[PDB]
Amino acid sequence: ALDTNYCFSSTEKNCCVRQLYIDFRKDLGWKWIHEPKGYHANFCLGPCPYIWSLDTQYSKVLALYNQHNPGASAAPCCVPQALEPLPIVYYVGRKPKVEQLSNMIVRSCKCS
Amino acid sequence: ALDTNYCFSSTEKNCCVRQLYIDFRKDLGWKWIHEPKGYHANFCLGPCPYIWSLDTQYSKVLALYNQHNPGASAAPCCVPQALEPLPIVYYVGRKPKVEQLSNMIVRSCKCS
Incomplete structure (x- = not known):
């Protein structure tokens, strides 16, 4: 599926959650959070066809x-x-x- | 806000639902639906900053x-x-x- 486990396993051309470690202060510069330095916010890119995990009806x-x-x-x-x-x-x-x-954090992407 | 009423009212650089009339068969070619010919599926493009309607925490x-x-x-x-x-x-x-x-149909977009 389009989860963070299937995306970092093989290749693909449709949507696919990719790595996106974000260092709280390095990337977001968040000053209201001290630890941890950051985390694996993960994220997803690429377009999304139909069968590719559809959330709303307009998504198909x-x-x-x-x-x-x-x-x-x-x-x-x-x-x-x-x-x-x-x-x-x-x-x-x-x-x-x-x-x-x-x-x-992200655990799996779909198509809103 | 980022609704189909505020997008077709002024300009903007952040996300914004734009017009996207879809003729069931012209664009989707849907053969399981006869009428209406189509409808205003509407849709949204452009990136999304933080305050710009945030849905999930990872959206900010x-x-x-x-x-x-x-x-x-x-x-x-x-x-x-x-x-x-x-x-x-x-x-x-x-x-x-x-x-x-x-x-x-779309009535307002946010940032998933």
Whole structure:
């Protein structure tokens, strides 16, 4: 399927979650989070046809709308369907607080 | 907001649902649907920063991941958040059947 386990296993031309490690401060420069340095936010690119994991009904109508005309830039938009939390540690003024951001990671993409 | 009412009102550089009328058979060639000829499936393009309607938490983390590095092709993917039904009419063998596809239209996009 279009998960982070099947994408880093073989090749493909349709959507496919690729690696996207994000260092909280290096890429996002987030100042409200101290640890961890970052995490594997993962992500997905490439277009999405029909059968390729369809979420909404319009995901299959437009998916073909493009698969029919070569050069149409109105294709669908593969995205992160299921996500994952994220154990971090920030500071409120001077008190340390470890939490677990929700849906801050990608576990599999589909086609919204 | 990023709805089909604010997109066809002024200009913008971030995501924005644009017109995408799809003629069931002209663009999708759908043979299982007779009427209507098509409909306003609408759709959305352009990238999506953070505050720009964020759906999942990773939608704001990656949104910045790109807004920080100029040239990063791993931005988010604006999509159809809310949708609409679709009154059609197809045929099962020889019996006529009018229905209302669900979520076959776009009413507003966000950032999955």
